Swiss-Prot record, chain A:
Protein name stated in the entry: Large ribosomal subunit protein bL19
Gene expressing this chain: rplS
GO biological process: translation
Function field: This protein is located at the 30S-50S ribosomal subunit interface and may play a role in the structure and function of the aminoacyl-tRNA binding site. Binds the 23S rRNA.
Quaternary structure and partners: Part of the 50S ribosomal subunit. Forms a cluster with proteins L3 and L14.
UniProt record similarity statement: Belongs to the bacterial ribosomal protein bL19 family.
Species the sequence originates in: Deinococcus radiodurans (strain ATCC 13939 / DSM 20539 / JCM 16871 / CCUG 27074 / LMG 4051 / NBRC 15346 / NCIMB 9279 / VKM B-1422 / R1)
Swiss-Prot record, chain B:
Family affiliation: Belongs to the universal ribosomal protein uL14 family.
GO biological process, one term: translation
Record NCBIfam families: rplN_bact
SUPFAM superfamilies referenced in this protein's UniProt entry, alphabetically: Ribosomal protein L14
This protein's name: Large ribosomal subunit protein uL14
Function field: Forms part of two intersubunit bridges in the 70S ribosome. Binds to 23S rRNA.
Alphabetized CDD domains for the sequence: Ribosomal_uL14
Pfam hit, one: Ribosomal_L14
The organism of origin for this protein: Deinococcus radiodurans (strain ATCC 13939 / DSM 20539 / JCM 16871 / CCUG 27074 / LMG 4051 / NBRC 15346 / NCIMB 9279 / VKM B-1422 / R1)
Keywords: Ribonucleoprotein, Ribosomal protein, RNA-binding, rRNA-binding
The keyword Repeat is annotated on this UniProt entry: no
UniProtKB/Swiss-Prot annotation, chain D:
Identification of the protein by name: Large ribosomal subunit protein bL17
Ribosomal protein keyword on record: yes
GO molecular function: rRNA binding; structural constituent of ribosome
HAMAP family in UniProt: Ribosomal_bL17
Family as reported in the entry's similarity comment: Belongs to the bacterial ribosomal protein bL17 family.
GO cellular component, one term: cytosolic large ribosomal subunit
PANTHER family named among the record's database cross-references: LARGE RIBOSOMAL SUBUNIT PROTEIN BL17M, RIBOSOMAL PROTEIN L17
Purpose of the protein: Binds to the 23S rRNA.
Gene3D superfamilies the UniProt entry points to: Ribosomal protein L17
Record NCBIfam families: L17
Protein's organism: Deinococcus radiodurans (strain ATCC 13939 / DSM 20539 / JCM 16871 / CCUG 27074 / LMG 4051 / NBRC 15346 / NCIMB 9279 / VKM B-1422 / R1)
Gene name as annotated: rplQ
GO biological process, one term: translation
InterPro entries: Ribosomal_bL17, Ribosomal_bL17_CS, Ribosomal_bL17_sf
Superkingdom of source: Bacteria
Swiss-Prot record, chain E:
One GO cellular component term: cytosolic large ribosomal subunit
Protein species of origin: Deinococcus radiodurans (strain ATCC 13939 / DSM 20539 / JCM 16871 / CCUG 27074 / LMG 4051 / NBRC 15346 / NCIMB 9279 / VKM B-1422 / R1)
The encoding gene: rplC
The protein, known as: Large ribosomal subunit protein uL3
Subunit structure: Part of the 50S ribosomal subunit. Forms a cluster with proteins L14 and L19. Also contacts proteins L13 and L17.
Keyword Ribonucleoprotein attached: yes
Taxonomic lineage from the root: Bacteria, Thermotogati, Deinococcota, Deinococci, Deinococcales
Record PROSITE patterns: RIBOSOMAL_L3
InterPro entries cross-referenced by the UniProt entry: Ribosomal_uL3, Ribosomal_uL3_bac/org-type, Ribosomal_uL3_CS, Transl_B-barrel_sf
Any one Gene Ontology BP term: translation
Length: 109, 134, 57, 113, 205
RNA sequence: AAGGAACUUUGCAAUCUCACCCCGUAACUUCGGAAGAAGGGGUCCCCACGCUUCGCGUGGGGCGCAGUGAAUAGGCCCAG
RNA sequence: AUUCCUUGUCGGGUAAGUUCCGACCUGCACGAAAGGCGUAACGAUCUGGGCGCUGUCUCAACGAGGGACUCGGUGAAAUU
RNA sequence: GAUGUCGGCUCGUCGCAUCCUGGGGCUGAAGAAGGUCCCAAGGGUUGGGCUGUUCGCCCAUUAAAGCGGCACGCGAGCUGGGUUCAGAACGUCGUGAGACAGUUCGGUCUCUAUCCGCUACGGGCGCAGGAGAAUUGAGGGGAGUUGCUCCUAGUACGAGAGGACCGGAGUGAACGGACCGCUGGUCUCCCUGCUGUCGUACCAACGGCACAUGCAGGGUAGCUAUGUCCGGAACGGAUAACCGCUGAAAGCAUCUAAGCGGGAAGCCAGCCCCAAGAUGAGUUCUCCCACUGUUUAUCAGGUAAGACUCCCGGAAGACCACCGGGUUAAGAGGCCAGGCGUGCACGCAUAGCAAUGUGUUCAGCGGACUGGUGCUCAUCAGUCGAGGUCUUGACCA
């Protein structure tokens, strides 16, 4: 409704690509180790989630991926944006033989 | 998002097996002891807000008993927590730690992880008892 | 329940209501070939002419 | 509101059974007389079906075999018409607005190849 | 004062330092001067400029005369900004610095004739407690014989949206200058491929 | 989604549950009963083996989120 | 199902119980085939509590189908 | 010849005898925290347990959990629990039929708005030519809530314990507005898996039907709240209670009797939205012009600028309206590429007695998304649409 010829998608990319990063070929069901970093007050710690990967979603800057682990008897999943600076290095560990693409059904485990 | 009827489980050895919510409040934890609310409302409780709660189940032997009331602080929203990078957490089961009026717990420790936001809002001690601070 | 009208309505209003029901007249044109009259963007019904012939005479 | 399609006051199972019989005849006889709407409904679905059939491989013929149920017609678009359509990128159909009618009083149309 | 025009291109996710800021992308392709109105001319203090371009053919005669009065080439769209001044013609560099709070105005996405819910946030009705045909209806309009009317402006079903909406104090995350692209913190009302005007904040703080 | 009777005059309504097989089953009792109490587990496809068959037990394999895979199909309990 | 005083007093359950259950006895105004007090089982009866499940609710959302709306055909009503 | 009643629910809006919040006087007011009274109605006023209940008691909070009016507001708005019909039982009255503002169980709340009123949206005409756009803001609506923490400060005060005003900085509830990038929902045929049965002759592959998706699994665009962004202000003018300056009547004293300053969450202005039907109809830029018709026809006609009509569509919308495109053309569809979605097609090969597995296959399939592309349709044309009344007045020839 301003009519103006323009590639919405490509200005989109123009921005949302400086803020974009690619990772290891994980397909879902692959187990993975993310080496996450935390800041505690001036100091920068370093935890590490390590789980079955259940969902990759979207793309470009907004591309994300959800891990799921059992940490101390209580079950917990967690979802990273491919390009969050509080996420340092992902590392495939296993390659799952997965028949679906979203892996929700494994929340009975 | 916890609200008044929510039966969360308990992370402590304070003898409360299972506690059910009953009000919410919105006190930080500053100065002398805990404080008194943002106000009336706040219709929901999520991770590190306090909730007043009644006690639904307990250990046949332990500090705190079957009916005992008493304020708890949340540790495991089955809901989801968005941290200012985009990271999201979520725990499969809903849970809390029981506490006293200066903050720290009637427990001797904590079972299962806790969300780094408890650290945000200065619950030192519970964060310390915590087996994992995700 | 069961709303009805309070008072019978007048010839006057009633025909002010009808004030619009007035039909709009097909705006027509003459159809370059067979020569009856066609509706704009449709087929001139006599011959069958949209630019050559389609539906038949 | 970026949605897209027609509900054509039928359900959803119907909607299909329609544009499948309608594609079935448009392919069965070069042009058809039918409501202007139901036509602008039958345009891009027949069209896409042209682009399935335009391909040769057995697949494309089972791909078509799903929507267009009668062998003769399938075979027609597969073997006969689609090939004929080779060098042309689209526009395998066109639409003509005739006029009115008595009962329903609805505008009407010819849709052709 | 401060102001310029451009399009709503899209909402996206980007990072400054460590946080997921959500940013909506505005464009503000150069706007040209067209009309400069002063008191001794038109009473009030303003400037009319223009956004999306248009080819001489699809253009009126009058509008042509207009756009020709200051050698400009037609813009599909005109608009005014009260109490401005510049010199030359108007882009976003020279107008915004990164971080400056700004008031962003658009039209909304409109919704058609909308329920008492959707429209005005009405309560509702006990979806299963015997409640004949009263599931979505606002209940009562008044009192009784007094006053015996219905109040002026009593909220009820109505065309929702397509309003002119302004949202206040928004922050210029990023200026992709001479690509006339603007990044702005958060929401901006009215649909993608939108027409929006970025003006300085109304306020101060 | 999170919660799970906070609804309300009352869980009104709607979901739960759902068939067949095998384990197992309370106070109370007029010894018939309660009782399908409760609560579990199995259920599909293939190959071999036995058995009274169309059939079925057993053993090993196979696949999908799930196998009365779709439809017909009890929510249960305590106490007046 | 009977209680005026009445939310009687006490206990149980609840975080909190005019309801409900037990006891109490000062039965306004129980009582023995106009049956009295019990009781297994039976109940689309009535009353309270629980477990389970749930848009009943917090707080509503998206979707679907049939209306409502538009066009051509036929065209009522109570009221006045 | 009918004004339907309690209570709930929905919806509201007024009063101020003010529950909170804001300002002040008094104090048996050191501070903190209070009592009480004057000003003050802008906004705000929680969730449950019992009872038909209003009410009231309790649970747990709160700045506060205000009091009342609007036919004890609100049934052509919903409930239908209380009471008021017929059935039945219990107590009590009555010899009886029957009885009781005693109790108890059950017990039909009636699809079409004519007018005023209201929310929205058009059609007409008006606004001294006929048009395309840009607008001043008369005046009118929304909005106005509040805690907690921290600094000032362990400072003033006070043996002490405790503990400020003022100012300044943050963080949050509820409400509102918008938004779909995130997190999720849904996504009625986008992709996949399933069964019983029918059919495409059979196998293999598919399609129906099992919803009005047969079931299950995911699910883009759009739409959404649980998600996100932003807000309530600052400042200024005039006030209330109140505090004072100069100061006479009444040589003194006096805020007042002439005059003057200060003074609130309130009024006006400031903020967001509508707004010249503001008939008092405003202003500005631009465009078309001074046409033709025996007044036997003192008003029409053909046209300019421009516009509709009609087709094609849209993040606009029930209709109308609104935005774009209409071949000088990228408007939509299709087509190509890509994205995203499903997750590894058919066939064939291979392994296996088979069920199946592996390969070929990051494979195949494809609703909305992003661009490119003249393959399709937006073809032809029909319909309107100016000639500018008078009066004075100033200015030019
Ligand atoms: Mg998702
Ligand atoms: Mg939140
Ligand atoms: Mg107990
Ligand atoms: Mg119809
Ligand atoms: Mg069907
Ligand atoms: Mg719309
Ligand atoms: Mg509702
Ligand atoms: Mg009146
Ligand atoms: Mg759930
Ligand atoms: Mg029921
Ligand atoms: Mg026995
Ligand atoms: Mg059983
Ligand atoms: Mg498996
Ligand atoms: Mg199994
Ligand atoms: Mg059933
Ligand atoms: Mg008691
Ligand atoms: Mg008897
Ligand atoms: Mg019987
Ligand atoms: Mg209860
Ligand atoms: Mg009709
Ligand atoms: Mg009457
Ligand atoms: Mg007063
Ligand atoms: Mg008020
Ligand atoms: Mg009265
Ligand atoms: Mg009343
Ligand atoms: Mg009434
Ligand atoms: Mg009743
Ligand atoms: Mg007697
Ligand atoms: Mg009407
Ligand atoms: Mg005004
Ligand atoms: Mg007026
Ligand atoms: Mg107002
Ligand atoms: Mg200090
Ligand atoms: Mg001290
Ligand atoms: Mg909100
Ligand atoms: Mg998106
Ligand atoms: Mg989504
Ligand atoms: Mg044969
Ligand atoms: Mg077969
Ligand atoms: Mg069939
Ligand atoms: Mg059949
Ligand atoms: Mg059927
Ligand atoms: Mg589905
Ligand atoms: Mg002043
Ligand atoms: Mg593609
Ligand atoms: Mg298809
Ligand atoms: Mg396209």
């Amino acid at each position: 409704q301003t009519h103006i010829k323009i590639n919405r998608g490509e200005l989109l990319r123009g921005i949302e690509q400086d803020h974009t990063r690619q990772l290891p070929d994980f397909r879902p069901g692959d187990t993975v180790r993310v080496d996450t970093k935390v800041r505690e007050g001036n100091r920068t710690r370093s935890q590490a989630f390590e789980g079955v990967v259940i969902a990759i979603n979207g793309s470009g800057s907004r591309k994300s991926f959800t891990v799921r682990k059992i940490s101390f008897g209580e079950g917990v999943e967690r979802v990273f944006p491919f390009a969050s600076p509080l996420v340092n290095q992902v590392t495939i560990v296993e390659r799952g033989k997965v028949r679906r693409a979203k892996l929700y059904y494994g929340k009975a485990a | 998002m916890i609200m008044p009827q929510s039966r969360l489980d308990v992370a402590d050895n304070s003898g409360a097996r299972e506690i059910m919510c009953i009000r919410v409040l919105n006190s930080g934890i500053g100065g002398k002891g805990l404080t008194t609310g943002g106000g009336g409302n706040k219709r929901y409780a999520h991770v590190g807000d306090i909730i007043v709660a009644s006690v639904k189940d307990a250990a046949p032997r332990g500090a705190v008993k079957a009916g005992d009331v008493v304020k708890a602080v949340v540790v495991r929203t089955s809901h989801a927590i968005k941290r200012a990078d985009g990271s999201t957490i979520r725990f499969d089961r809903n849970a809390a730690v029981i506490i006293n009026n200066q903050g720290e717990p009637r427990g001797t420790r904590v079972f299962g992880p806790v969300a780094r936001e408890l650290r945000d809002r200065r619950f030192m001690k519970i964060v310390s008892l915590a087996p994992e601070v995700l | 329940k069961h709303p009805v009208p309070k008072k019978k309505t007048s010839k006057s209003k009633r025909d002010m209501r009808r004030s619009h029901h007035a039909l709009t007249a097909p705006n027509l044109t003459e159809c370059p070939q067979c020569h009856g009259k066609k509706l704009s963007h449709h087929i001139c019904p006599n011959c069958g002419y949209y630019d050559g012939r389609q539906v038949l005479a | 509101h970026g949605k897209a399609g027609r509900k054509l006051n039928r359900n959803s199972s119907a909607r299909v059974a329609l544009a499948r019989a309608q594609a079935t005849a448009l392919l069965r006889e070069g042009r058809i007389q039918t409501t202007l709407t139901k036509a602008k409904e039958l345009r891009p679905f027949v069209e896409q079906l042209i682009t399935t059939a335009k391909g040769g491989d057995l697949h494309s013929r089972r791909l078509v075999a799903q929507d267009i149920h009668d062998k003769d017609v399938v075979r027609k678009v597969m073997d006969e018409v689609a090939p004929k359509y080779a060098e042309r990128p689209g526009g395998y159909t066109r639409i003509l607005r005739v006029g009115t009618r008595r009962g329903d009083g609805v505008t009407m149309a010819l849709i052709e190849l | 004062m401060k102001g310029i025009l451009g399009t709503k291109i899209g909402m996206t996710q980007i990072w400054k330092n460590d946080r997921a800021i959500p940013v909506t992308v505005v464009l503000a392709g150069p706007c040209p001067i067209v009309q400069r109105k002063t008191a001794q001319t038109d009473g009030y203090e303003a400037v009319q400029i223009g956004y999306a371009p248009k080819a001489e053919r699809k253009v009126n005669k009058p509008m042509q005369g207009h756009f020709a009065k200051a050698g400009v080439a037609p813009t599909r769209i005109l608009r005014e900004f009260r109490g401005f001044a510049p010199d030359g013609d108007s882009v976003n560099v020279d107008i915004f610095a990164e971080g400056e709070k700004i008031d962003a105005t658009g039209t909304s996405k409109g919704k058609g004739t909308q329920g008492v819910m959707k429209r005005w946030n009405f309560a509702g009705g006990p979806a299963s407690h015997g409640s004949k045909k009263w599931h979505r209806r606002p209940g009562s309009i008044g009192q009784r014989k007094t006053p015996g009317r219905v109040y002026k402006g009593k909220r009820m079903a109505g065309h929702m949206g397509m309003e002119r909406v302004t949202v206040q104090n928004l922050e210029v995350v990023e200026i992709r200058a001479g690509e006339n692209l603007i990044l702005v913190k958060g929401a901006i009302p009215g649909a993608n491929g939108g027409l929006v005007v970025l003006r300085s904040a109304a306020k101060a703080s």
